[PDB]
């Protein structure tokens, strides 16, 4: 955040040099923010076995509001602060975050946004992610990162977050553009929602769809600012106006926030409850589906 936009992307070369030169410690912390659907890869375990040297695992299963019925919702300020402090991250630390997902980035934008929605601007995603760190032959360890605990002060930057109530008031004001980053079929209600029973697919009326995978090249890299800009413009998303991103559970919505951030817009808000919460709370009239339910 801050219009002195802190660099949101860091390359594999850059991070390999900093690892190699002994720079990760209290000034630079690196997080594996991997998570995968129940049944596929075991994120946590996969980290214990291979990670960039000095990287800690950031567990999204843990650093979330566990009491909520909805999926991966923000913790409290204090809950985030405690978690992140134990990983040796202070308010002065530059946090770099990657995940090991196959198109280079899935969950790392969510953690980049979590740090920012708690007022920490000095965070960046590893461009190419762990997939390209591996492909380039940079070092990995199984040895445990045991950082000193640090004090982190979290302050919820509420302009970067939307609640159910605000997205529902926006249906009568259109003061914010609403973009959904799910795959087109899920957005249209013709393909089902994964890892749920009884949850229909569809989208909030007035949402525009920008499938998050299209911000990445097949190699796993973020597309250039030049291409990202053109994508918003083809969808007629005006980057000088308020924009709210949403998806299924507020995770890939952060890719729209990252994409816009590389285009110079630092304040895309994420509707954290997203489709899962919306479907369970919203008046059924507020959403459409081509299955029609």
From Swiss-Prot:
Modified residues annotated as N6-acetyllysine in this record: 13, 135, 162, 174, 223, 235-236
**Enzyme kind, highest EC tier:** transferase
What note about domains is in the entry? Contains two rhodanese domains with different primary structures but with near identical secondary structure conformations suggesting a common evolutionary origin. Only the C-terminal rhodanese domain contains the catalytic cysteine residue.
The listed outcome for residue 186 to L is: Reduced rhodanese activity
> Where is region (Hinge) located?
143-158
Read off the Pfam families from this record. Answer: Rhodanese
Listed under catalytic activity are: thiosulfate + hydrogen cyanide = thiocyanate + sulfite + 2 H(+)
- Per the record, the domain of life is Eukaryota
An individual GO BP term: rRNA import into mitochondrion
Which organism is the protein's source? Bos taurus (Bovine)
The lineage, from the top, is: Eukaryota, Metazoa, Chordata, Craniata, Vertebrata
> Which EC numbers characterise this protein's activity in its record?
2.8.1.1
Annotated ranges, domain Rhodanese: 24-142, 172-287
Q: Any idea what this protein is called?
A: Thiosulfate sulfurtransferase
């Amino acid at each position: 955040v801050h219009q002195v936009l802190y660099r949101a992307l860091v390359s594999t070369k850059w991070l390999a040099e900093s690892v190699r030169a002994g720079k990760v410690g209290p000034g630079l912390r690196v997080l594996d923010a991997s998570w995968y659907s129940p049944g596929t890869r075991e994120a946590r375990k996969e980290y214990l076995e291979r990670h960039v040297p000095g990287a800690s695992f950031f567990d999204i299963e843990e650093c979330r509001d566990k009491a909520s019925p909805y999926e991966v919702m923000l913790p409290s300020e204090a809950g985030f602060a405690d978690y992140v402090g134990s990983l040796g991250i202070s308010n002065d630390t530059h946090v770099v975050v990657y995940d090991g997902d196959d198109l280079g980035s899935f969950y790392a934008p969510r953690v980049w946004w979590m740090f920012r929605v708690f007022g920490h601007r000095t965070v960046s995603v590893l461009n190419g992610g762990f997939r390209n760190w591996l492909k380039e032959g940079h070092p990995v360890t199984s040895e445990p990162s045991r950082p000193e605990p640090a004090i982190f002060k979290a302050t919820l930057n509420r302009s970067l977050l939307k609640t159910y109530e605000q997205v529902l008031e926006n249906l009568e004001s259109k003061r914010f553009q609403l973009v959904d980053s799910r795959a087109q079929g899920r957005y249209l209600g013709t393909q089902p929602e994964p890892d749920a029973v009884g949850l229909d697919s569809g989208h909030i009326r007035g949402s525009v769809n920008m499938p998050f995978m299209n911000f990445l090249t097949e190699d796993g890299f973020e597309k250039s600012p030049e291409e990202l800009r053109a994508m918003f413009e083809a969808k007629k998303v005006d980057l000088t106006k308020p924009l709210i991103a949403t998806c299924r559970k507020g995770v890939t919505a952060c890719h729209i926030a990252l994409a816009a951030y590389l285009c110079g817009k630092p304040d895309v808000a994420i509707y954290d409850g997203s489709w899962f919460e919306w479907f369970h709370r919203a008046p059924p009239e507020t959403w459409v589906s081509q299955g029609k339910g």
